[PDB]
Design a protein around this ligand. Structure first.
Ligand SMILES: *[C@@H]1O[C@H](CO)[C@@H](O[C@@H]2O[C@H](CO)[C@@H](O[C@@H]3O[C@H](CO[C@H]4O[C@H](CO)[C@@H](O)[C@H](O)[C@@H]4O)[C@@H](O)[C@H](O[C@H]4O[C@H](CO)[C@@H](O[C@@H]5O[C@H](CO)[C@H](O)[C@H](O)[C@H]5O)[C@H](O)[C@@H]4O)[C@@H]3O)[C@H](O)[C@H]2NC(C)=O)[C@H](O)[C@H]1NC(C)=O
Ligand SMILES: *[C@@H]1O[C@H](CO)[C@@H](O[C@@H]2O[C@H](CO)[C@@H](O[C@@H]3O[C@H](CO[C@H]4O[C@H](CO)[C@@H](O)[C@H](O)[C@@H]4O)[C@@H](O)[C@H](O[C@H]4O[C@H](CO)[C@@H](O)[C@H](O)[C@@H]4O)[C@@H]3O)[C@H](O)[C@H]2NC(C)=O)[C@H](O)[C@H]1NC(C)=O
Ligand SMILES: *[C@@H]1O[C@H](CO)[C@@H](O[C@@H]2O[C@H](CO)[C@@H](O[C@@H]3O[C@H](CO)[C@@H](O)[C@H](O)[C@@H]3O)[C@H](O)[C@H]2NC(C)=O)[C@H](O)[C@H]1NC(C)=O
Ligand SMILES: *[C@@H]1O[C@H](CO)[C@@H](O[C@@H]2O[C@H](CO)[C@@H](O[C@@H]3O[C@H](CO)[C@@H](O)[C@H](O)[C@@H]3O)[C@H](O)[C@H]2NC(C)=O)[C@H](O)[C@H]1NC(C)=O
Ligand SMILES: *[C@@H]1O[C@H](CO)[C@@H](O)[C@H](O)[C@H]1NC(C)=O
Ligand SMILES: *[C@@H]1O[C@H](CO)[C@@H](O)[C@H](O)[C@H]1NC(C)=O
Ligand SMILES: [Ca+2]
Ligand SMILES: [Ca+2]
Ligand SMILES: [Ca+2]
Ligand SMILES: [Ca+2]
Ligand SMILES: [Ca+2]
Ligand SMILES: [Ca+2]
Ligand SMILES: [Ca+2]
Ligand SMILES: [Ca+2]
Ligand SMILES: [Ca+2]
Ligand SMILES: [Ca+2]
Ligand SMILES: [Ca+2]
Ligand SMILES: [Ca+2]
Ligand code: NA
Ligand code: NA
Ligand code: NA
Ligand code: NA
Ligand code: NA
Ligand code: NA
Lengths: 276, 291, 287, 276
């Protein structure tokens, strides 16, 4: 395994021998992608590169197949063809049939190992809250008064000890997204400067609490207290309130009550401030 | 808190973080990644004493030879100048951070509690090729004649088709020794035609076709080699060997005659001087049959 | 040669005429930080129009300077005669080539050869690196370097300190004393921009029984700000132990009368220099 | 102890210097070096003939200079304000100040460097008879063709013996040719062939100019060929008096060339071949 390398056609830059099938296995260390690019391409031209060809296979799938006479169009770049993959290994197979109509000099290519930016390069991000990329790997981080769970990937809230002073921050139910603990009352407190208003956002889909009885009274409940004002109790699958909520208060108490049985996924939210 | 020559990434915090920071404090921590790397960094939490123009408290981050940022305030508040999460990249391998705080953190005249900051820094690889300072590089020669390559940490160089890399791994010579030709027809041209030919060369352009054919050499225009009317080919020579024996040492301005060899093996030997003014030569070689 | 002042390089068998069919390359090497000067005393070779037959090829620092042949006096030849051939680096490559026949185009000929004398010389490192170009970092000096034989050493402008690398200089500007009756005090390199990152204590200590009169001159240019006065740069003035004003801006401060025999002007700069600075006349009176 | 470079500053540089001082510095470089002493800063109490305060440059017994006053460099491309060059390996600098300073004077800042003496050119008297060679730190002499340097290492002298000619076809000329021949010398050249051959000497009628004979016709300077019993010469005057082709009828030949103290001329040149 290397961080860089050179691959030339047999007998470069002379004419290549006929009836050949040569293979190269590219390998870089863990957590690196590969950039493979061709500085020279002059191969026997056939439709679907039937007679002679140079082949790029990653794992089981054919990333490319090249043939023909071609030189770089950009005068600012020597690259003629190129490929980028999120994998740590590649395979290149050059094969030629028993005849050449003209003289074909083959090909000259090079590969380099690139860091995978695990946060951005994929659509799936392997961190619940915050992602940190570094050359050769990644690791996760969390928002105010959150503690990272054993799996090194997802973060979690504690039910007590937390006074929130950040202007923009997150709050979740304990164990989230795992089910919330039974027979507990979790109160989280936000305390801002007097001139600000706490505005609470939580996604309509990020809320699933034990449903109410037939009469509509929540058996498990979540409620926001702002002095005299009060929002809730909220329960059921799906947040019934609007996704953006104004409390009109600089200090807010969020209370979460559960009984002995009948638990569910739970909820998550993020808050910011607005002047008065 | 992690300044060290051999380290990928690291953490730099305000003092006592997360506990609020003490007044009357100024500390400079310098990040150092190894040679050939840039320093990227961002702030997760940021909560400082705000001030119009950051007179009171501030974080001063400075690059190679320039202060990029001096910033203060809280993550969200518009009281001025928070980085929040923005990228701060260096050019070289060193990033100087400083944290300053005066005696009074308690404004309006009642106590206030300010936590600090969480700086995360990544190393990155720099593109040595793309720098492009074409002149003002005599001590190093960090740019290559034909092409260099950008990879993590270092960089290595390579030459255009038909050239050899010489010891310095920055410049290239011509190989032009075992230039083979076995195909039926073909074209042979002096290196980099019709531009001037390199000097100090010993070329053996060898043609070896299947026995039972005869070769037909047709020189094209232009044909330009340093000659002299008194004695021909003193500086540059283009000798032609056919069937083992020399058949003509050519140089000049008008092209040599179209040659018919009666041979299946020719060798064009090319000897150059130590200067290149003239352009060169190009030829089509074709094959005919016998009974 | 690792270490040599001077030397002789001759044609083979010199003075006896040189043998035909011969080509030899001799390379002169003076030590590091020297140039190679050389000239020819005697020069007698086989002449040829364009030096096809025989020649001396002298080349320095990846460039062939000369390829010369013929006799000291004779035309139709390219002789150096006595001309100076200096290298830039410390190496000079010489070569001598000769075909099989030097005795045909007339009839028999007897050609002696050549006497090359070479001196070493010192190179001017300063004028080499600082004459043109070079914005990237190079090992060149900040205020002034010195050219002497072999090596080079560096020094700083009046009132500056040389830092360890012996290439760059900061300002000292800490114990700047003034004990004379009258005098002038000016920020470093006035009215050019003042250096950044300074802690200056311009101390005036006159004979007791006098009072000091500080008169600021124009121009007076320090980075100021309309919101808060002196955030980046400050010019504090201490008199008789106590502060008497922290100044910055564009109009000069008022002429100050101290009633003191001991004043200290403290100068704090930021990390950039746009503004020019300040200058003052200090005079003494009696009490 | 001798150095190649050095720095000299006024006491307490760059502050005001003390009064009533007389400080001295002794500059010293190794043998055969001159000295270049130059001043980068000059601000000294100004007096006529630098009476009150002064900085003084003395080489041996003689005053090479005396500086005082306020002065800065006029050329913006050079920091040098005053300078001196001397052919000696040692110098003396004496700075003296009287008991008062009316204004504040920062003193002076100067530097010295050792330079090679080019013994050939730097003096009017050249210590070599024929050719002079300078090198960094000394000199040595050299000579023209077939001259040998005399014991005194300075003056050269001609030899014209020790060379035995065995070639069948060869050349001989007078020393320094075509420059004038040396005075008070006897030059004998010897040719030795196989028994069966004859030395035949050719020399062009125009390639011969030797001091003419007296009124009576006796050559004051002469050239003569000795072949066993036969003898050709003495020859002298402008133009070779003999035929352009001379047959000696001998396989061994001695050519003798006699000159007196004064009355020299261009000289002669010849080429010889053999005949069975
Ligand atoms: C320009 O480039 C051409 C490239 O072909 C080059 O021509 C080649 O020159 C060499 C010079 O030696 C020849 O090689 C051998 O010559 C041997 C001659 O032996 C005599 O001369 C010796 C000195 O040269 C001396 O020491 C000996 O004592 C003796 O007096 C000869 O024995 C030998 O025969 C073998 O030939 C081939 C290898 O060439 C062997 O293998 C065959 O190779 C061909 C491919 O060419 C094919 O693959 C066959 O399948 C394979 O069997 C074979 O088995 C013999 O044992 C060899 O010939 C080359 O012959 C010659 N190549 C030609 C003429 O095509 C020029 O010199 C170059 N010019 C320059 C550099 O200026
Ligand atoms: C700029 O540079 C100047 C000089 O370069 C500095 O001044 C020196 O430092 C201080 C401040 O002026 C002086 O110290 C004070 O000295 C007073 C008497 O002076 C003599 O005493 C000292 C000690 O014996 C001698 O070494 C000195 O040479 C003097 O002869 C004292 O009265 C002071 O003592 C205490 O007084 C009362 C107690 O009753 C306390 O309240 C005070 O706080 C003080 O501590 C004090 O010792 C010193 O003399 C100055 N001159 C020198 C050292 O030569 C400036 O400080 C400097 N400024 C800046 C901003 O850098
Ligand atoms: C959320 O709540 C948990 C409750 O468990 C809190 O964890 C507390 O963490 C401290 C560490 O600061 C634990 O101390 C232990 O010390 C030993 C000895 O050094 C060490 O080996 C253990 O690994 C652990 O750190 C403490 O036991 C624990 N508190 C309780 C009551 O169990 C904390 O507030 C939050 N979670 C985490 C992981 O910090
Ligand atoms: C030049 O020709 C002659 C004869 O072949 C040789 O030169 C001789 O050179 C030596 C010095 O190396 C001289 O030696 C000295 O001779 C004096 C005579 O008075 C003697 O007193 C000393 O003790 C010393 O031996 C010698 O004179 C001189 N001969 C001459 C000038 O006829 C030499 O072979 C030839 N080449 C050179 C380079 O001299
Ligand atoms: C108290 O805070 C207010 C904020 O508006 C400010 O106007 C006032 O000056 C502060 N009090 C004092 C004594 O500074
Ligand atoms: C030498 O050759 C050139 C040209 O071949 C001729 O000019 C000259 O007369 C020849 N003979 C000499 C120089 O004795
Ligand atoms: Ca094929
Ligand atoms: Ca990674
Ligand atoms: Ca429940
Ligand atoms: Ca503060
Ligand atoms: Ca790199
Ligand atoms: Ca040429
Ligand atoms: Ca020759
Ligand atoms: Ca030097
Ligand atoms: Ca400034
Ligand atoms: Ca005085
Ligand atoms: Ca000398
Ligand atoms: Ca005479
Ligand atoms: Na090939
Ligand atoms: Na939960
Ligand atoms: Na060409
Ligand atoms: Na200034
Ligand atoms: Na002084
Ligand atoms: Na003569």
């Amino acid at each position: 395994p290397t961080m860089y390398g050179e691959i030339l056609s047999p007998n470069y830059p002379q004419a290549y021998p006929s009836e050949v099938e040569k293979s190269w296995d590219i390998e870089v260390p863990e957590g690196y992608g590969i950039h493979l690019y061709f500085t020279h391409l002059d191969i026997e031209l056939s439709e679907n590169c039937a007679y002679d060809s140079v082949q790029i296979i990653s794992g089981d799938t054919e990333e490319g197949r090249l043939c023909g006479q071609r030189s770089s169009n950009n005068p600012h770049s020597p690259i003629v063809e190129e490929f980028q993959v999120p994998y740590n290994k590649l395979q290149v197979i050059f094969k030629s049939d028993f005849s050449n109509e003209e003289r074909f000099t083959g090909f000259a290519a090079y590969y380099v190992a690139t860091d995978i930016n695990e946060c951005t390069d994929f659509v799936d991000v392997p961190c619940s809250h915050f992602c940190n990329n570094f050359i050769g790997g990644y690791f996760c981080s969390c928002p105010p008064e959150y503690f990272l769970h054993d799996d090194m990937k997802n973060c979690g809230v504690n039910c007590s000890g937390d006074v929130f002073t950040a202007l923009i921050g997150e709050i979740a139910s304990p164990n989230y997204p795992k089910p919330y603990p039974e027979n507990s009352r979790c109160e989280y407190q936000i305390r801002l400067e007097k001139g600000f208003q706490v505005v609470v956002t939580l996604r309509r889909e990020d809320f699933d609490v034990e449903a109410a009885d037939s009469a509509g009274n929540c058996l498990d409940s979540l409620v926001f207290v702002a002095g005299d004002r009060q929002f809730g109790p909220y329960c059921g699958h799906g947040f019934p309130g609007p996704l953006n909520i104004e409390t009109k208060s600089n200090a807010l108490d969020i209370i979460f009550q559960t009984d002995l049985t009948g638990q569910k996924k739970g909820w998550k939210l993020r808050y910011h401030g607005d002047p008065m | 808190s992690i300044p060290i020559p051999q380290k990928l990434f690291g953490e730099v915090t305000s003092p006592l973080f997360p506990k609020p920071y003490p007044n009357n404090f100024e500390t400079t921590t310098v990040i150092t990644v190894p040679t050939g790397y840039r320093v990227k960094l961002v702030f997760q939490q940021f909560d400082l004493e705000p001030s119009e123009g950051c007179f009171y408290d501030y974080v001063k981050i400075s690059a190679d030879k320039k202060s990029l940022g001096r910033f203060c305030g809280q993550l969200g508040s518009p009281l001025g100048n928070p980085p929040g999460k923005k990228e701060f990249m260096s050019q070289g391998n060193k990033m100087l951070l400083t944290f300053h705080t005066d005696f009074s953190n308690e404004e309006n005249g009642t106590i206030m509690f300010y936590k600090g900051f969480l700086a995360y820094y990544q190393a990155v690889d720099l593109d040595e090729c793309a720098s492009r300072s074409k002149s003002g590089e005599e001590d190093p020669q960090p740019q290559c004649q034909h092409l260099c390559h950008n990879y993590v940490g270092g960089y290595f160089c390579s030459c255009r088709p038909g050239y050899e890399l010489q010891e310095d791994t920055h410049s290239c010579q011509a190989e032009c020794s075992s230039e083979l030709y076995t195909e039926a027809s073909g074209y042979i041209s002096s290196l980099e035609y019709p531009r001037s030919y390199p000097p100090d060369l010993r070329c053996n352009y060898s043609i070896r076709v299947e026995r039972g054919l005869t070769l037909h050499l047709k020189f094209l225009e232009p044909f330009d080699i340093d000659d002299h009317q008194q004695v021909h080919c003193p500086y540059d020579q283009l000798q032609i060997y056919a069937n083992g024996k020399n058949i003509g040492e050519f140089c000049g301005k008008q092209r040599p005659p179209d040659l018919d060899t009666s041979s299946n093996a020719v060798d064009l030997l090319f000897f150059t001087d130590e200067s290149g003014d003239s352009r060169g030569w190009k030829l089509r070689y074709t094959t005919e049959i016998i009974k």
